[PDB]
């Protein structure tokens, strides 16, 4: 087997590919190769080559060679490096140029910023001295730097004969006509490539496999027979990168594009909407391959009960009729981009039309780090930044929020330098502009002054907690591993025996004993997705998103296989159908519980979704959840004993100082009958008392310094402040037992009545 999920993004091994490296020659057209490398392409020193760039761009250079280079390296010139839209570590393709084709005239114009002091035409002074009889190749739209006197001027080719690229002949005599080139083009050279997107690598691979292959190799599909899909439907949290992904793939694939907008078409007068849609479709069709993107497709096609207007129904039905007309098959690939999948009229998700749904979710930690690394470039940031901590802090953040965070940090940086800047003057010294630098405290200030946008989403990612944190419970780990990891990791044994596994595990025990910790640990070990849903969450969404929200969760369960759906706090919902209970107060559970029961029975079709429960009141739970196929197996998590308390005490103080003055073995004797929450609380209270003692010691030292500044500095500065015996002795005098003897008696009786048939031995 192979990791084919992201294998389409791999750098394929071809003789044309070479790794981009730094260069040593300042010539605008000379590129240095390796003597053995030229043998692969049958090249020699002095020849002319074509080097491809990004977004269907390319340039033409002169192939040179040196023995200090490497085989995969190319040593691209810095100006040509900017021309090719590549950097260090990139891969570029090199081809031969049999067509030298000296051009009769080449139009070249400089940039406005570097021509300060120029009195007129720059042809004789700058163009001809380095291009007369030099036979240098030039490609349209490329930048090359030249020098004259002390003035360094960058020039861009405006026109060529042929228009692609040609060699500057001695007869290429021109004069500076017009002035279209401006410095403001610096930020608008090329909108988006492929590397300018991060965090959605899997979805980007899906889109690539769906779109780029049909648009570049229809022969394979025609041979196999299956018609490629057309309608992609990107959906996700607002401002998560949908338009960016669509524009990236469209510009990189080289196909035609037609960026339709929702309100823009809805802004047209009646009759003009249909005409504009027809013009868009016809323009796309007449220049196949084409891509039609419809931003905010939900705006022009809402749900039926919310679009009773006549013209709205007219435009919706015209869109439907045109969409069913995709039989034209001119590689027209509609890419709708909504934000809520329920908001689109379900008539747009039948066979044909939009045959796909791609969920662009909130990026994970590595995705946030990647997008921050993308945005932090092209800024005068200092060399003491720390992106890892920033990425760790930011949670519930989408790409737009981080784009705003970088701007906020820069704004704080410019605000902090206003002490010298006076707004009474209309001019500012260049030193202030050149002295700007960004530090980590600026990012902390920006983060403290910013707010996330998507904390409410049901985030899905593999958890981090491992069995090391787990405080003992080896029997439960042994059972849970063979009940969860084996049926997914090793289904071959199950299918050979032909006895299908069950997909329900239920936890019941006293509060705070490692239920959620166990669920997250088993989710992390199996490397499966984890979806935590609470009782309060469902109870609130039953009034926020009505009943359908519940189904949405299971839908999100079945679109992210393999999945571990953890229904935390089932005691609020799974209460038994009390006869005396009535009204809304007693019947609120009577809807969510029934919807859950209906969904669980249909969930048995999949073989990669595992449902885990959690309760602290095993007696009040409804019997309907104990039917086979539903959450059948009941696993009891008891109050940890002496050795388990020792293990949890060991696991609690991993980050805290040594505190070796107290043997942790004696602690378990003290804390008999304490749950895990009480042990963690005791650790936290001891740490807080240690912090208070260190704070008062520091205050005493500062007071001593203030009383006598002449007094020499002592060793009373803030130390590590290891936790001492007095800390625990004082801390454990206020604690309490979270579970009384009556509750543990109840749990023990509940276990006893469930374990009365142990007579076999």
Ligand X SMILES: Nc1ncnc2c1ncn2[C@@H]1O[C@H](COP(=O)(O)OP(=O)(O)NP(=O)(O)O)[C@@H](O)[C@H]1O
Stretch that binds ligand ADP, among 58-66, 380-388, 673-681, 705-713 (CB under 6 A): 673-681
Q: Which of 355, 469, 479, 571 binds ligand ADP (CB under 6 A)?
A: 469
Q: In what order do the strands lie in the sheet with 529-534?
A: 529-534, 563-568, 609-613, 504-508, 633-636
State the Cα torsion 595-601-602-603 to the nearest 10°: 100
**DSSP for 339-360?**
S-TTTS-GGGSSSSSS---EE-
Size of the site for ligand ADP (CB under 6 A): 19
Q: Where are the beta strands (DSSP E) in 516-654?
A: 529-534, 563-568, 609-613, 633-636
295 makes contact with Mg ion (CB under 5 A): yes
591 makes contact with a copy of itself (CB under 8 A): yes
**Residue 399 partner contact from a copy of itself, ligand X, ligand ADP, none using kind-dependent CB cut-offs of 5 to 8 Å:** ligand X
Alpha-carbon span 627 to 625, nearest angstrom:
6
Identify the DSSP state of 269.
P
439 makes contact with Mg ion (CB under 5 A): no
Looking at beta carbons only, is 394 or 516 nearer to ligand ADP?
A: 516
471 makes contact with ligand ADP (CB under 6 A): yes
40: tokens are: 């692969």
Contact 249, 207 (CB under 8 A): yes
**Residue 471 partner contact from Mg ion, ligand ADP, ligand X, none using kind-dependent CB cut-offs of 5 to 8 Å:** ligand ADP
Q: What is the pattern of x (binds Mg ion, CB under 5 A) and - over residues 238-267? A: -----x------------------------
Rg, Å, the chain Cα set? 34
Is residue 229 marked as binding? no
Closest approach, Cβ 472 to ligand ADP, in A, equals 6
Looking at beta carbons only, is 82 or 576 nearer to ligand ADP?
A: 576
348 makes contact with ligand ADP (CB under 6 A): no
Is residue 198 marked as binding? yes
Contact 589, 573 (CB under 8 A): yes
Name residues whose C-beta falls within 8 Å of residue 539's C-beta, 6 or more positions apart in sequence.
572, 573, 588, 592
590 makes contact with a copy of itself (CB under 8 A): yes
Q: Where are the beta strands (DSSP E) in 8-136?
A: 17-19, 30-33, 48-52, 58-65, 91-96, 102-103, 107-110
Is residue 236 marked as binding? yes
Name residues whose C-beta falls within 8 Å of residue 537's C-beta, 6 or more positions apart in sequence.
none
Q: Which of 3, 133, 584, 707 binds a copy of itself (CB under 8 A)?
A: 584
**Residue 47 partner contact from Mg ion, ligand ADP, a copy of itself, none using kind-dependent CB cut-offs of 5 to 8 Å:** none
Looking at beta carbons only, is 249 or 523 nearer to Mg ion?
A: 249
**Residue 98 partner contact from ligand ADP, a copy of itself, ligand X, none using kind-dependent CB cut-offs of 5 to 8 Å:** none
Contact 181, 153 (CB under 8 A): no
**Residue 197 partner contact from Mg ion, ligand X, ligand ADP, none using kind-dependent CB cut-offs of 5 to 8 Å:** ligand X
Name residues whose C-beta falls within 8 Å of residue 650's C-beta, 6 or more positions apart in sequence.
664
**Residue 403 partner contact from ligand X, Mg ion, ligand ADP, none using kind-dependent CB cut-offs of 5 to 8 Å:** ligand X
Alpha-carbon span 677 to 665, nearest angstrom:
19
Q: Where are the beta strands (DSSP E) in 281-340?
A: 290-295, 332-337
**Closest among 265, 269, 259 to 334, alpha carbons compared:** 259
**DSSP for 165-199?**
EEEE-TT-----------GGGGGGS-S--STT--S
Q: What is the pattern of x (binds a copy of itself, CB under 8 A) and - over residues 394-423? A: -xx---------------------------
595 makes contact with a copy of itself (CB under 8 A): yes
Residues in binding site: 198, 236-244, 375, 509-517
Residues flagged as binding site for ATP: 509-517
| Residues in binding site for ADP | 198, 236-244, 375
- Chain positions contacting a copy of itself, by CB under 8 A: 395-396, 448, 452, 455-456, 511-512, 534, 536-537, 539-540, 543, 569, 572, 577-588, 590-591, 594-595, 597-598, 601-602, 605, 608, 624, 627-628, 677, 680
Kindly list the residues in this chain that would bind ligand ADP in the complex (CB under 6 A).
Answer: 469-471, 473, 511-517, 614, 627-628, 648, 651, 676-677, 680
């Amino acid at each position: 087997k192979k990791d084919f999920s992201t294998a389409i993004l791999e750098r394929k091994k071809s003789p044309n590919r070479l790794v981009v490296d730094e260069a040593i020659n300042d010539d605008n057209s000379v590129v240095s190769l390796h003597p053995a490398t030229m043998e692969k392409l049958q090249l020699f020193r002095g020849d002319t080559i074509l080097i491809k760039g990004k977004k269907r761009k390319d340039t033409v250079c002169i192939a040179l060679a040196d023995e200090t280079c490497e085989e995969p390296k190319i040593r691209m010139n810095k100006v040509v490096r900017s021309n090719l839209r590549v950097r260090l570590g990139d891969v570029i393709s090199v081809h031969q140029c049999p067509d030298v084709k000296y051009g009769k005239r080449v139009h070249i114009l400089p940039v406005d910023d570097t021509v300060e002091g120029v009195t007129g035409n720059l042809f004789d002074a700058y163009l001809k001295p380095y291009f007369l009889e030099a036979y240098r190749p030039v490609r349209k739209g490329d930048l090359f730097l030249v020098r004259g006197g002390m003035r360094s001027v960058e020039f861009k080719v405006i026109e060529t004969d042929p228009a692609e690229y040609c060699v500057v002949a001695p007869d290429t005599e021109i004069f500076c006509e017009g002035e279209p080139v401006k410095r403001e083009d610096e930020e608008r050279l090329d909108d988006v490539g492929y590397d300018d997107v991060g965090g959605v690598r899997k979805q980007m691979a899906q889109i690539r496999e769906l779109v780029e292959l049909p648009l570049r190799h229809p022969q394979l599909f025609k041979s196999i027979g299956v018609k490629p899909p057309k309608g992609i439907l990107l959906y996700g949290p607002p401002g998560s990168g949908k338009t960016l992904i669509a524009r990236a793939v469209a510009n990189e694939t080289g196909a035609f594009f037609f960026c339709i907008n929702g309100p823009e078409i809805m802004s047209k007068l009646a009759g003009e909407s249909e005409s504009n849609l027809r013009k868009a479709f016809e323009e796309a069709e007449k220049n196949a391959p084409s891509i039609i993107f419809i931003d905010e497709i939900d705006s022009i096609a809402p749900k039926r009960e919310k679009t009773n207007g006549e013209v709205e129904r007219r435009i919706v039905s015209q869109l439907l009729t045109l969409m069913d007309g995709l039989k034209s098959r001119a590689h027209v690939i509609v890419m709708g981009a909504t934000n809520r999948p329920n908001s689109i009229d379900p008539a747009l998700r039948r066979f044909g039309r939009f045959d796909r749904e791609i969920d662009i979710g909130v990026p994970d930690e590595i995705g946030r780090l990647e997008v921050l690394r993308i945005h932090t470039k092209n800024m005068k940031l200092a060399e003491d930044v720390d992106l890892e901590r920033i990425s760790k802090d930011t949670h519930g953040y989408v790409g737009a929020d981080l784009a705003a965070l970088c701007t906020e940090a820069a704004l704080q940086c410019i605000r902090e330098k206003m002490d010298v800047i006076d707004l009474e003057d209309d001019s500012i010294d260049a030193e202030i502009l050149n002295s700007m630098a960004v530090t980590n405290e600026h990012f902390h200030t920006a983060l403290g002054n910013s707010n996330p946008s998507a904390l409410r989403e049901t985030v899905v990612e593999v958890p981090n907690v491992s069995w090391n944190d787990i405080g003992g419970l080896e029997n439960v780990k042994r059972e849970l591993q063979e009940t969860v990891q084996y049926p997914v990791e090793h289904p071959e044994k199950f299918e050979k025996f032909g006895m299908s596994p069950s997909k329900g595990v239920l936890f019941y025990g006293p509060p705070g004993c490692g239920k959620t910790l166990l669920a997250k640990a088993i989710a992390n070990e199996c490397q499966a997705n984890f979806i935590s849903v609470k009782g309060p969450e469902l109870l609130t969404m039953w009034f926020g998103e009505s009943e359908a929200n519940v189904r949405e969760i299971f839908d999100k369960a079945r679109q992210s296989a393999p999945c571990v759906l953890f229904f935390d706090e089932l005691d609020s919902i799974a209460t038994q159908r009390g006869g005396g209970s009535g009204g809304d107060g007693g019947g609120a559970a009577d809807r969510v519980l029934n919807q859950l029961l209906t969904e669980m029975d249909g969930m048995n079709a999949k073989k990669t979704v595992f449902i885990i429960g959690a309760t602290n009141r095993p007696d009040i739970i409804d019997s309907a959840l104990l039917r086979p196929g539903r959450l059948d197996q009941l696993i009891y998590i008891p109050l940890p004993d002496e050795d388990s308390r020792l293990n949890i005490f060991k696991a609690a103080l991993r980050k805290s100082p040594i505190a070796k003055d107290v043997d942790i073995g004696a602690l378990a004797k003290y804390t008999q009958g304490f749950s895990g929450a009480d042990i963690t609380e005791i650790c936290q209270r001891a740490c807080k008392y240690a912090i208070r003692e260190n704070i008062e010691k520091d205050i005493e030292k500062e007071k001593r310094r203030s009383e006598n500044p002449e007094a020499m500095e002592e060793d009373g500065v803030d130390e590590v402040s290891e936790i001492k015996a007095a800390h625990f002795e004082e801390s454990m005098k206020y604690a309490r037992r979270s579970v009384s003897d009556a509750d543990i008696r109840k749990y023990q009786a509940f276990a006893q009545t469930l374990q009365q048939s142990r007579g076999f031995g």
